[PDB]
Design a protein around this ligand. Structure first.
Ligand SMILES: NC(=O)C1=CN([C@@H]2O[C@H](COP(=O)(O)OP(=O)(O)OC[C@H]3O[C@@H](n4cnc5c(N)ncnc54)[C@H](O)[C@@H]3O)[C@@H](O)[C@H]2O)C=CC1
Length: 419
């Protein structure tokens, strides 16, 4: 009933927005447990901290103890907002920075700050296409088109679909916000210029979408792998099973080295390497990825032309992160190797100090397989991708890995799309 008297979009009608928000906010708060009420209050005070913590937690090693009251806040805010699901779509609004679209060109004209640069917004149009922008943490937004200046260049007009957990909350009863649950992504649906208080903003129309992304959920991940690739495993030829297992047991070193630049160990031959590559690649064409999925990879510095001791690889310094972002944002990188990925975001002990974390949109139809169906229960939840694809670099987002075992260093989350 709480959506019976409202449009999908309040537009500029703040009075109708407030009437709607006040009623559902009251119902919602009374349905919260004490723990949920506390965590929502914690979000009002410490939202930046909670959202930043959620990133550290999802990319940490398994033995990460973390901060127990923030662990509680992550759980309780999520169960809280799930008590307030929309019954019809709701359009929402927020100003946004360049960085959240992986865009590093100024959209302001050089000659007039009120005016958007035509060439920049043309490049922006290409950059936001063909991309699902993962939204980390919880996202809070406003109900009406802002009537105030922003230092930010972009206005997002975001369509939340029916059944989105989206709770009315906040301390200003006349400007109540909307708190969106974790786990969503943004998909642009249109681009235009909007003028607000005499100044032009790039207006991104977008849908809120939910991509399959297991993060730390080992139970769901292994179930998905079993369901979708147990038959794949049984139908492998003997050689395909053999050379898949060779690769996964340590043959990757020689196989991917050869695919990268033709290196041949002394005791092997080109023809034996070609054979293994042919059987693995044939196996990976047998069952295309059945739905869009996010997978992960702890990447070594050579995958971006860097060496372990390169000064440019020290992301603890600001200028190196800026250099890396300038070099790779928006680029397409061909990948000659097979790509070993995992459906879990957890850091991996053998790779704990690698500083580059691939977060890969792996499309429906990709030649890849959940290969861990073959191993025993000590497995790494792996999706192996065929050689010869490319990465489209969508975003680069730093976070600080404080852990001794992680290397006490900034690391870069590289959001990419497989092409
Ligand atoms: N790295 C990861 O996140 C995951 C790896 N595994 C498994 O661990 C084992 C070893 O994994 P990796 O060390 O990652 O094998 P790998 O052959 O991909 O990489 C080994 C070394 O070669 C570099 N390298 C790989 N591809 C490159 C490319 N196109 N260009 C330049 N340098 C490249 C890497 O940075 C690394 O230093 C495999 O069985 C693999 O399936 C399992 C879960 C995910």
């Amino acid at each position: 009933m709480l959506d019976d008297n409202r449009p999908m979009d309040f537009a500029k009608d703040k009075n109708s927005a407030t009437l709607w928000a006040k009623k559902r906010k009251q119902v919602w708060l009374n349905n919260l447990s004490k723990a949920e009420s506390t965590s929502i209050n914690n979000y009002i005070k410490n939202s930046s901290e909670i959202n930043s913590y959620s990133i550290k937690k999802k990319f940490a090693l398994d033995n990460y103890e973390g901060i127990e009251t923030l662990n509680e806040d992550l759980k309780n805010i999520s169960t809280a907002v799930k008590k307030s699901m929309l019954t019809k779509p709701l359009y929402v609004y927020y100003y946004e920075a360049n960085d959240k679209f992986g865009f590093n060109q100024n959209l302001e004209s050089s000659l007039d700050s009120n005016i958007i640069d035509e060439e920049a917004i043309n490049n922006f149009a290409k950059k936001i296409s063909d991309t699902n922008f993962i939204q980390d943490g919880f996202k809070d937004v406003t109900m009406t088109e802002p009537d105030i200046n922003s230092k930010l260049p972009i206005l997002v007009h975001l369509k939340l679909p029916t059944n989105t957990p989206a709770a009315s909350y906040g301390n200003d009863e006349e400007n109540l916000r909307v708190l969106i649950d974790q786990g969503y992504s943004l998909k642009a649906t249109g681009l235009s210029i909007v003028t607000i208080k005499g100044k032009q903003y790039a207006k991104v129309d977008a849908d809120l979408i939910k991509q399959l992304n297991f993060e730390n959920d080992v139970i769901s991940a292994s179930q998905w792998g079993e369901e979708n690739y147990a038959p794949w495993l049984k139908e492998l030829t003997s050689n395909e099973l053999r050379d898949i297992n060779n690769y996964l047991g340590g043959g990757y070193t020689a196989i991917n080295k050869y695919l990268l630049d033709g290196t041949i160990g002394e005791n092997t031959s080109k023809e034996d390497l070609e054979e293994k590559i042919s059987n693995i690649s044939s196996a990976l064409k047998k069952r295309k990825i059945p739905e869009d999925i996010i997978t992960y990879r702890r990447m070594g510095p050579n995958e971006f032309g860097l060496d372990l001791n390169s000064p440019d690889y020290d992301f603890n310094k600001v200028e190196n992160v800026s250099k890396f972002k300038e070099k790779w944002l928006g680029k397409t990188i061909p990948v000659k190797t097979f790509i070993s990925t995992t459906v879990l975001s957890n850091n991996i002990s053998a790779f704990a100090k690698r500083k580059l974390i691939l977060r890969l949109h792996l499309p429906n139809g990709s030649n890849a397989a959940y290969v861990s169906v073959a191993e025993g229960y000590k497995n790494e939840y792996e999706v192996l991708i065929d050689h010869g694809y490319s990465y489209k670099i969508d975003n680069i987002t730093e976070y600080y890995d404080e852990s001794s075992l992680g290397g006490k260093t900034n690391k870069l989350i590289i959001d990419a799309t497989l092409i």
